Amino acid sequence: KSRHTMSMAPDVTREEFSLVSNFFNENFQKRPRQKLFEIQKKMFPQYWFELTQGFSLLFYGVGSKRNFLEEFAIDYLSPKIAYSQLVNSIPCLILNGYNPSCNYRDVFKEITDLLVPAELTRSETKNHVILQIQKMIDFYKNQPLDIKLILVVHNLDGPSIRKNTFQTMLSFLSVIRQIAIVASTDHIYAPLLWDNMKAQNYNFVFHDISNFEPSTVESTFQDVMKMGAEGAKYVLQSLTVNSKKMYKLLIETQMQNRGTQRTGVELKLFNHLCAADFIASNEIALRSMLREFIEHKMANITKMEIIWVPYTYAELEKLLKTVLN
Amino acid sequence: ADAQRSHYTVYPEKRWELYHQLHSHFHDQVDHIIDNIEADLKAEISDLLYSETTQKRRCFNTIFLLGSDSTTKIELKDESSRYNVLIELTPKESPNVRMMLRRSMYKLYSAADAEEHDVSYDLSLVENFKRLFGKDLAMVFNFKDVDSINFNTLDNFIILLKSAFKYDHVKISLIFNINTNLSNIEKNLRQSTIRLLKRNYHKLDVSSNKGFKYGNQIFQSFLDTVDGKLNLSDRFVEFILSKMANNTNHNLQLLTKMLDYSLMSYFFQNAFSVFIDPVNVDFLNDDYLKILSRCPTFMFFVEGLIKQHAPADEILSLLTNKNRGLEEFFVEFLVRENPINGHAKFVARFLEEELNITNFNLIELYHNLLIGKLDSYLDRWSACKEYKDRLHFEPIDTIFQELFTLDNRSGLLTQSIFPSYKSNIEDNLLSWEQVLPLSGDLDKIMAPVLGQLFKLYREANMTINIYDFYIAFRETLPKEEILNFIRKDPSNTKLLELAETPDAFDKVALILFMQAIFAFENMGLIKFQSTKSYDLVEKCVWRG
Amino acid sequence: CISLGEPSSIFQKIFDSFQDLNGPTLQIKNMQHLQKFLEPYHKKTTFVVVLDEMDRLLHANTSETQSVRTILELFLLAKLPTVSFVLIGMANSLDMKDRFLSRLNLDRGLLPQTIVFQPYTAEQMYEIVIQKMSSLPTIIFQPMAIKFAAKKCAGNTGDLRKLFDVLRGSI
DNA sequence: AATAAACAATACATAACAAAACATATAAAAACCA
DNA sequence: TGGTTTTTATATGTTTTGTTATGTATTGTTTATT
């Protein structure tokens, strides 16, 4: 099974990747991107009018929408509605769904403090969350209709917001007329999240926004093998000078023969080999500064008593000519 | 800057008023109908919860509320010299036999002290409730979502309640809010407990859609709110037939949504909306007079005018040669009441009580009216055969109604309410030209980053190799443009040392490839099968 | 930072140099709550904190949930006046830089100058022992054997006073 | 119908592995008394 | 609010079970002869 693999790739370090990535995402398709941004700007009065009807507005589409939501919520809408009701403008409570550390307790503790504490709602605080919001709902059915809060939920299919006890929590918020719910998702299976029970509470409407954004902030928490061959690449840069030499003698005869088990070496002769260059005194002095290569998982052993390096054929000669030399 | 911290708050019309007098007036008819079923559901539980005096008097009364939406709230009678408390148990609060008992005893106990003006939270309070609180006890159990619970926990729960039947100062009542499927429920429990259940059961149906007694009602109250000032076209209403048929549980909240959004479309683009009150004739303008001309029933009647009156000197004069008679030609047909509304209200009350028929849908009754299929509508009972001549109406081809109408002739609320979700995403990624219009010269000769692999992503196998896909990805990139792009900027220095490297093109491809396939995981298009190996992945998204 | 597992009471201990009294719990808990704490009182001398033994919180509870977020939140110095809480943190194993997110590795905060200390073979540590022999006895042994001690301990070592504390046992 | 012999086509026993059921552990959330 | 307990999310380990590939053994197919 001769497969080309990501290990057999010309790799790129940390500062080299992120800088040339920053060059593309700020200079690739710049002119048509704001050219799209001016086209969709005329839809902004249409969103203002429908949002008076308490409609949970939901934005789908390819690409990141995070920049677009923060322009649309903060600068455009939130002072426009305060001027049209008649003083600080309408409070914006974003929810970063791409941040996995969102819970149901903490954000709702913000909500009841963002909303009015007209009564002793801490008396009903005793899981009373659905209980406390139910007492909020029926009181809000008989209030004068005006928006006092707009909340934003970025990346609604996020790692914590998509949990099911959190989803139903947002469902009861959306039936209230005083708050406007402007959220965005990115998943292709996002309408698996809602049944006709929740969408009854939601009354979602949909709009496409596809600007093909790079998702700068949303790439940070995510990881691939860019983010071990690269792990032990830094430990050797800070050790004793003898460990460099005893790894150099290790890496030679382990690459004398991918870097697999079969190219490895027996412990006895390697003790004698590192006794030959006046390096290893005995087995214990060898093994103790070999456990340091073991503790940071920089070498393997299987069974001759074969110690072999788990990095590729291409990687070890890169480890040869750069850091060992 | 702060976006990695989660939930940081910050503290930064002649036409529309005629909408405002119409919208809320309609919504007063909505919510008043909503409290009617709210008073209906609260009534029929309340009488049936009481007055049921069985002879054995050692059994709880159970109530199965079939078809119920798991949200049905209940009020209770005061019924003095006895406290009556409500306990609700959500399947989220059903982990075991143990905490189903322990939270539920806690929930009534605070409800007991608040009416009373240290103890243990189990059945010890239940016997001593006569001494702990004076008056007796009649608790009720709002099991919210009953089919998600492991039933052996529920079966072991009800045997625990069976032990409370020997104290005679307490009365038990169970409310089973099923979603549906009563036959499923008698399959899951232990049969020894069904015989415990079957003493005094009552299978009351609670459904929002029950013989359309409210569905046909709310569409009827819609029609009088827009009576005579608009129309409802045929292609519009069949959308309301088809799509509302796809949602069984809650039609009534959905019919409010798609109708009010449809009314929001009319006020936002149509200029003749101001003329639905004849007081606004002074707002007439040549720009309004110009846009009246392209109405289809307007120009078709002119084609009807020439063939009927082969003398066309009158017809040419009433065209834009005059303007005073031209608008007078319009306001001749302005006040058309269109009695299809009133003819519907004529026949709606009739078969409701004259023939007394209830299994009928008023919307398709309005739709069959719009084509003339009212004769082939009443056939399904064969009861209007003595009345098909007096309930008869041929739908006349009315004139100037295309300016006062609602229809999805543009596919708007088809799109913005029921979006072809993975269709519109996949259409956005194959084409990309109808979404996007120094360095932009590169864009006219190179695709955007996400979409350029997508054509090969279609052309790849079920499970694919990572590197050969990149090898295919390097084919689509020509070499001369990138070195023209990487050497475009003389101002930056840190990029320019990479720009002069002779292997820069093959390095900048794997950087750019690892920004796109990095970005095809949050969309869930490609799944990384067997982590820490990631030599092959799986593609789930297919075109359909 | 040894016995916390949690980022609050560090911002309590900077208050201990004030010898004052306030409402402590909220101000030391949230990211934004630290920002109110950074307005000095007497003469406008800037403050720098020193975070000792940061690796107990690095090698605390699960990375991208709490501890990396704790690492993230501390290194953010976007404050506008020059009174900024400059960090000096310390760690054993050098994996911690690659653990940083790609936004943070874009020349942000105090991460850059990754000042390392290679283990002194004998060429800077033994000479400190010489100056730590300011009060010199007559026979403190042939110092070339002390040089012999330094050369043949420097295979696997870091602390020559402690490796003089094995000379102090043989003395 | 049986025998024999050369050849082709298929089945079989097991090696190697994958994946789901079955099982435990601990830091972080989340209720929850108090 | 505040400590304490309980559940959940994340993480890894164990045993059973089911799939597939392959080299070798079996079995069918054809033709000549008894």
DSSP letters for B236-288: HHHHHHHHHTT--S-SHHHHHHHHHHHHHHHHHH-GGGGGGSGGGGGG--HHH
Both tokens of B326, joined, read 């031209």
The owner of tokens 């340091």 is: A292
CA end-to-end span of chain B: 40
| Separation between the CA of C124 and the C1’ of D3 (whole angstroms) | 98
| Separation between the CA of B1 and the C1’ of D31 (whole angstroms) | 34
Q: How far is B497 from chain C (nearest CA, A)?
A: 18
Contact, B116 vs B133, CB < 8 A? Answer: yes
Contact, B399 vs B333, CB < 8 A? Answer: yes
The Cβ-side half-sphere exposure at B4, using a 13 Å CA radius, reads 24
Instruction: Round to whole Å and give the CA distance between A179 and B184.
Output: 40
Instruction: Round to whole Å and give the CA distance between B198 and B195.
Output: 5
Instruction: Round to whole Å and give the CA distance between A205 and A55.
Output: 7
Compute the residue count for chain A.
325
Q: Are C78 and B1 within 8 A, CB to CB?
A: yes
Burial class of residue B115 in the structure, from the number of CB atoms within 10 Å of its CB (0-12 exposed, 13-18 middle, 19+ buried): exposed
Burial class of residue B6 in the structure, from the number of CB atoms within 10 Å of its CB (0-12 exposed, 13-18 middle, 19+ buried): buried
Q: Does C32 touch chain B (CB under 8 A)?
A: yes
Both tokens of A160, joined, read 């914590």
Instruction: Round to whole Å and give the CA distance between B366 and B224.
Output: 13
Instruction: Round to whole Å and give the CA distance between B304 and A324.
Output: 95
- What is the CB neighbour count within 10 angstroms for residue A45? 11
Nucleotide nearest to C24 (CA to C1'): E1
Residues 6-45 of A with CB under 7 A from strand D: none
Compute the residue count for chain C.
171
Both tokens of B174, joined, read 């169970």
* SS3 label, residue B299: helix
Instruction: Round to whole Å and give the CA distance between B385 and A306.
Output: 97
Nearest-CB residue to C94 (from A234, A285, A288)? A234
Q: How far is A228 from chain C (nearest CA, A)?
A: 11
C120: Cβ–Cβ under 8 A, 6 or more apart, which residues? C160
| Separation between the CA of A123 and the C1’ of E6 (whole angstroms) | 23
A242: Cβ–Cβ under 8 A, 6 or more apart, which residues? A279, A289, C154, C155, C156
Q: Are B1 and C101 within 8 A, CB to CB?
A: no
Q: Using a CB-CB distance cutoff of 8 angstroms, which residues of chain B are in contact with residue A188?
A: 421-422, 425, 523-525, 541
| Separation between the CA of B461 and the C1’ of E17 (whole angstroms) | 29
Q: Which nucleotides of D are covered by protein (CB under 7 A)?
A: 19, 27-33
Q: Does A102 touch chain B (CB under 8 A)?
A: yes
Query: A153 forms bridges with which residues in the sheet?
Result: A95, A183
Hey, CA dihedral for A250, A251, A253, A254, is it positive or negative? positive
Instruction: Round to whole Å and give the CA distance between B93 and B148.
Output: 11
Helices A104-114 and A129-140, axial angle in degrees (round to 10) = 30
Per the rule left: phi > 0, alpha: psi between -120 and 50, beta: everything else, B81 is: left
C76: Cβ–Cβ under 8 A, 6 or more apart, which residues? C31, C108, C109
Burial class of residue B80 in the structure, from the number of CB atoms within 10 Å of its CB (0-12 exposed, 13-18 middle, 19+ buried): exposed
Instruction: Round to whole Å and give the CA distance between B52 and B64.
Output: 15
Instruction: Round to whole Å and give the CA distance between B252 and B268.
Output: 25
B356: Cβ–Cβ under 8 A, 6 or more apart, which residues? none
Nucleotide nearest to B92 (CA to C1'): E7
Q: Using a CB-CB distance cutoff of 8 angstroms, which residues of chain B are in contact with residue A66?
A: 3
Query: B463 forms bridges with which residues in the sheet?
Result: B538
The method recorded for this entry reads cryo-EM
Contact, A324 vs A248, CB < 8 A? Answer: yes
Per the rule left: phi > 0, alpha: psi between -120 and 50, beta: everything else, B70 is: left
Reported as type and span, the H/E element at residue C26 is helix C24-27
Helices B340-353 and B362-371, axial angle in degrees (round to 10) = 130
Instruction: Round to whole Å and give the CA distance between B118 and B110.
Output: 12
Burial class of residue A120 in the structure, from the number of CB atoms within 10 Å of its CB (0-12 exposed, 13-18 middle, 19+ buried): exposed
Q: Which nucleotides of E are covered by protein (CB under 7 A)?
A: 1-2, 6-11
Query: B9 forms bridges with which residues in the sheet?
Result: A93
The owner of tokens 């002649």 is: B14
Both tokens of B245, joined, read 């048929």
CA end-to-end span of chain C: 37
CB C62 under 7 Å to nucleic chain E: yes
* SS3 label, residue A175: coil
Pairing state between β A92-96 and B9-10:
antiparallel
Q: Using a CB-CB distance cutoff of 8 angstroms, which residues of chain C are in contact with residue A230?
A: 98
Q: Are B4 and C72 within 8 A, CB to CB?
A: yes
Nearest-CB residue to B467 (from A8, A16, A218)? A8
Distance from CA of residue A20 to its chain's centroid? 20
Q: Residues 283-302, chain A: which have Cβ within 8 Å of B?
A: none
The phi, psi pair for A24, rounded to 5°, reads -70, -50
* SS3 label, residue A207: strand
| Separation between the CA of B135 and the C1’ of D33 (whole angstroms) | 27
Both tokens of B42, joined, read 């609260």
- Radius of gyration in angstroms for the set of CA atoms belonging to chain C, rounded to a whole number: 22
Query: B522 forms bridges with which residues in the sheet?
Result: none
| Separation between the CA of A159 and the C1’ of E10 (whole angstroms) | 13
Contact, B63 vs B118, CB < 8 A? Answer: no
The phi, psi pair for A280, rounded to 5°, reads -90, 125
Q: How far is B507 from chain C (nearest CA, A)?
A: 18
The phi, psi pair for B267, rounded to 5°, reads -70, -15
Contact, B5 vs A100, CB < 8 A? Answer: no
- What is the CB neighbour count within 10 angstroms for residue A296? 18
Instruction: Name the residue type at position B539.
Output: K
Measure Cα distances from B195 to A283, B151, C33 in Å. 78, 16, 62
Instruction: Name the residue type at position C64.
Output: E
Contact, B244 vs B251, CB < 8 A? Answer: yes
| Rounded (5°) CA angle C163-C166-C168 | 115
CB C61 under 7 Å to nucleic chain D: yes
Distance from CA of residue B143 to its chain's centroid? 25
| Rounded (5°) CA angle A280-A285-A290 | 90
Measure Cα distances from B285 to A259, B290, B315, B328, B484 in Å. 84, 8, 22, 13, 57
Instruction: Round to whole Å and give the CA distance between A78 and A147.
Output: 10
Instruction: Name the residue type at position A140.
Output: Y
Instruction: Round to whole Å and give the CA distance between A148 and A151.
Output: 10
